[PDB]
Design a protein around this ligand. Structure first.
Ligand SMILES: O=P(O)(O)C(O)(C[n+]1cccc(F)c1)P(=O)(O)O
Ligand SMILES: O=P(O)(O)C(O)(C[n+]1cccc(F)c1)P(=O)(O)O
Ligand SMILES: CC(C)CCOP(=O)(O)OP(=O)(O)O
Ligand SMILES: CC(C)CCOP(=O)(O)OP(=O)(O)O
Ligand SMILES: [Mg+2]
Ligand SMILES: [Mg+2]
Ligand SMILES: [Mg+2]
Ligand SMILES: [Mg+2]
Ligand SMILES: [Mg+2]
Ligand SMILES: [Mg+2]
Lengths: 357, 358
């Protein structure tokens, strides 16, 4: 039922925004139709993990009848805030990554009647909607300020991780806006240390810490959990989640994934890249430097081939195990003083551990 | 003084942001050097009208204590950059959307040598985040904080809305449908003055004229002291005028002065010139228009320039400028009545606008 009560609030939100545009920004039906379409296409079709997580946390920590109602509603609004937030970032990211499809559909900036210049702004509109909806729905909620403050923080950190991502293939020593530079040749920066930094900031926060946090804020139970642990967890699961993202972008068929991979082509500092490099021989690495970051598909097949022949699947399974170990412990360590939360966190994990997509 | 105090705060702001990243965002010195450069390039070199307007207003009110003055003036500086940083965010993104080549004497951000088009997009995002980061850090204990952010974001929102009206102004809006592809309008039935006035109102008037005046009133804590109604008419009127000026320069002002190269004609933009010409152009002229508008072809572009001359647009301009200079004068006097200090600051801003050179 949460999925349907969530979609229910979506209509509620879409109605407000769209009608507000027609009534106070004197927008035309044509463009109202466009934004409705834009909204549904960029915000729907995902796994809704972030949004559904918020609702779960809220529900779980429920401890009147009108309250439960209000709370669950507030959760739905927050969920869409995060959902609208990822929407804003996927739009821009696909433009930044030159991706082809998203959620079994052409990337927004790829749709025929959508131009790149407009997609960039359509993305901007998404980010404003996160505020417009929070303000309108939480105008009276005392937790409004704190909520937005945290939201912008996470948003800001994600934009920082993105910077790390989109520049990992450039020797930072030479990184000078005034002087042009080619993709790194030595890859001397493709380290797990550097990899851990990208992932932590570009994904962990908004994908894991934020949904959890927003649930505690709307349930007004924030001060009841061991944040220090809760974050450790979020940082951990987030890293994992992103490592999966990387692996699928290389080995999970789009028909299944919903998106065509671009890392190898984009010369990204992925999990596969840093792991391979750290364990590969000079011969293997020379070949890598000869086929990585190339659109040419037979070269991508070379890279893909190289990874398989270095047993990355072994490293992966090993990593995934070490993670499951710590996650298990931290959740218990958390369950002690926060049974309900620990439970929702454990749930969020179920949606994570060995996901297919 | 104004500029020196403004620049003073800038370095202070650049110091907080860049250091927070270093210490709390696990950032390296290389990427900190970059962001500092990105900040100085995207936020500096402009005319600083929006920013300095906050300060001017703030001061004009100072006298409605030596410590207050020091705080009100500082808060005005912070809000001043919030707008400059927001202006910077939209300029980076717009230069991409408009495929422009130069900005403030240098190449557009996304056209800098070590700045890739996709990174520039994100750098733009960083620009907008900073506005929030600086406000939250300097105004944490200010009671006006919420109201302040609320107003800022709505204006941020409206601008993005104006951007939508501008970026799709050359497309048959009835065909607007993500699924189906479509070409540039060929009949131009939408290049109307009403449509032009809407684009400008939202994409510019608010963040270039209303916001600066409001932020100043807020940090002055004089917001309720002025006729908001009149204040809005002024902003909307001055805002539209400022944009019309922007469009005219886009086509006739030399890049050398303007600081940027024009792209409206080649971008098939619904500019003030296009709508005015179309409104007074004879069939013969309109047809030659449709055949030379919307192409990078240097020769075609030179034709549109000539066509505008032929229609005596400068004549249309002088008139518009006059009618606007008219009402602006009146409205300021309505203000002066209940708000002399604010009306004065408004006049200053109008001084920075009227017959601007760039
Ligand atoms: O699966 P993708 O490619 O959409 C990705 O995970 C999206 N994404 C992830 C994190 C932050 C972001 F702004 C965007 P990537 O980082 O581009 O690989
Ligand atoms: O001189 P330009 O071309 O940079 C412009 O005035 C910028 N600009 C103006 C208003 C809003 C905006 F986001 C961006 P234009 O509208 O693209 O002509
Ligand atoms: C953060 C990240 C890996 C981006 C993709 O996130 P996701 O796979 O959860 O996104 P959706 O399920 O919303 O499309
Ligand atoms: C017309 C417009 C809002 C964009 C250019 O604004 P502006 O000329 O005030 O910008 P700068 O002086 O900041 O470069
Ligand atoms: Mg990415
Ligand atoms: Mg991507
Ligand atoms: Mg990916
Ligand atoms: Mg432009
Ligand atoms: Mg534009
Ligand atoms: Mg212009």
């Amino acid at each position: 039922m949460p999925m349907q009560m969530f979609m229910q609030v979506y209509d509620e939100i879409q109605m407000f925004l769209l009608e507000e545009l027609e009534l106070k920004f004197d927008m035309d039906p044509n463009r109202v139709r466009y934004l409705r379409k834009m909204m549904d296409t960029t915000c729907l079709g995902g796994k809704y993990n972030r949004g559904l997580t918020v609702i779960d946390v809220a529900e779980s920590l429920l401890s009147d009848g009108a309250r439960r109602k209000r709370v669950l509603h507030d959760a739905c609004v927050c969920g869409w805030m995060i959902e609208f937030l990822q929407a804003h970032y996927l739009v821009e990211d696909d433009i930044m990554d030159n991706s082809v499809t998203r959620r079994g559909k052409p990337c927004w900036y790829r749709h025929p009647d959508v131009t790149v210049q407009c997609a960039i702004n359509d993305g901007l509109l998404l980010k404003s909607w996160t505020h417009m909806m929070a303000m309108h729905f939480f105008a009276d909620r005392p937790f409004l300020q704190d909520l937005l403050c945290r939201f912008n923080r996470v948003d800001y950190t994600t934009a920082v991780g993105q910077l790390y991502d989109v520049t990992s293939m450039f020797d930072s020593n030479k990184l000078d806006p005034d002087v042009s530079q080619p993709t790194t040749t030595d890859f001397a920066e493709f380290t797990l240390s550097n990899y851990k930094r990208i992932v932590k900031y570009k994904t962990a926060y908004y994908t894991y810490l934020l949904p959890l946090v927003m649930g505690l804020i709307v349930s007004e139970a924030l001060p009841t959990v061991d944040m220090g642990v809760t974050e450790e967890l979020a940082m951990l699961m987030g890293e994992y989640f992103q490592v999966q993202d990387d692996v699928m972008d290389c080995f999970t068929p789009p028909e299944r994934l919903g998106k065509v991979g671009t890392d190898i082509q984009d010369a990204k500092c992925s999990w596969l890249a840093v792991t391979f490099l750290a364990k590969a021989s000079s011969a293997q690495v020379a070949e890598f430097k000869a086929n990585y970051g190339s659109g040419d598909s037979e070269k991508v097949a070379t890279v893909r081939r190289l990874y398989e022949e270095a047993d990355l699947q072994g490293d992966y399974v090993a990593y995934e195990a070490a993670v499951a170990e710590q996650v298990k412990e931290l959740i218990e360590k958390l369950r002690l003083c926060s049974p309900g939360f620990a439970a929702s966190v454990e749930t969020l994990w179920g949606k994570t551990y060995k996901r297919q997509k």
